[PDB]
Amino acid sequence: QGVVCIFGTGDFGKSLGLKMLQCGYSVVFGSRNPQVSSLLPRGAEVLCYSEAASRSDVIVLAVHREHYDFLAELADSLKGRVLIDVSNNQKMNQYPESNAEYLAQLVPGAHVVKAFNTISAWALQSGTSRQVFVCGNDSKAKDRVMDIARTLGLTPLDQGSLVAAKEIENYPLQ
Numbered sequence: 001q002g003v004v005c006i007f008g009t010g011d012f013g014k015s016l017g018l019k020m021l022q023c024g025y026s027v028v029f030g031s032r033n034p035q036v037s038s039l040l041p042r043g044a045e046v047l048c049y050s051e052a053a054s055r056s057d058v059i060v061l062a063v064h065r066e067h068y069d070f071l072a073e074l075a076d077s078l079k080g081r082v083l084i085d086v087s088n089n090q091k092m093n094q095y096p097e098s099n100a101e102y103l104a105q106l107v108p109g110a111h112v113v114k115a116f117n118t119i120s121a122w123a124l125q126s127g128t129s130r131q132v133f134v135c136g137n138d139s140k141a142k143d144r145v146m147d148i149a150r151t152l153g154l155t156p157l158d159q160g161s162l163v164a165a166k167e168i169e170n171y172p173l174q
Ligand SMILES: NC(=O)c1ccc[n+]([C@@H]2O[C@H](COP(=O)([O-])OP(=O)(O)OC[C@H]3O[C@@H](n4cnc5c(N)ncnc54)[C@H](OP(=O)(O)O)[C@@H]3O)[C@@H](O)[C@H]2O)c1
Pocket: 007, 008, 009, 010, 011, 012, 013, 030, 031, 032, 033, 061, 062, 063, 064, 065, 067, 086, 087, 088, 089, 116, 117, 118, 119, 120, 121
């Protein structure tokens, strides 16, 4: 399989990265501090966000909505890439716009696809629902994310356009 980029090196990023390496992807991490990488897998490459962006066409945004802001200055080197929003909020109606729609405007030249938000960090390793709700405004971007979902052992369901994102984000809260 090809290359995938994971922005962020926390619980979700690490867990997905490891699973993706195990399924045959090459993985590149984007990080604020790529000189700290002890807990990251020897097979992944670890770079600054700007450099990680240019290494792949698919970028998993393993960051919380609260720290999306840095993407605004990168939005030029994210042009034409797939950006997977995996985010949840801590509580219902915490924001008037869906996180994935907010990202879509922070980065107007990327194709945003919502996916993976209902998978717990480390559930891909423990082998303990396989369903993944996917939405987005571009079918080529969505189909690419759905293929990733299947290669990881998951069952993706196309819920429509990015307007479906709010309900997908609400799902683990309710
Ligand atoms: N944890 C879960 O079980 C889970 C499940 C489903 C979905 N998600 C979603 O996955 C995303 C990441 O969650 P997490 O649990 O992995 O969060 P986390 O452990 O706190 O990691 C967040 C990552 O954000 C990056 N980041 C970029 N800018 C940051 C800033 N200004 N402040 C702090 N971190 C910054 C950091 O990577 P660097 O330091 O390398 O820059 C950090 O490792 C969230 O959107 C969450 O809702 C999480």
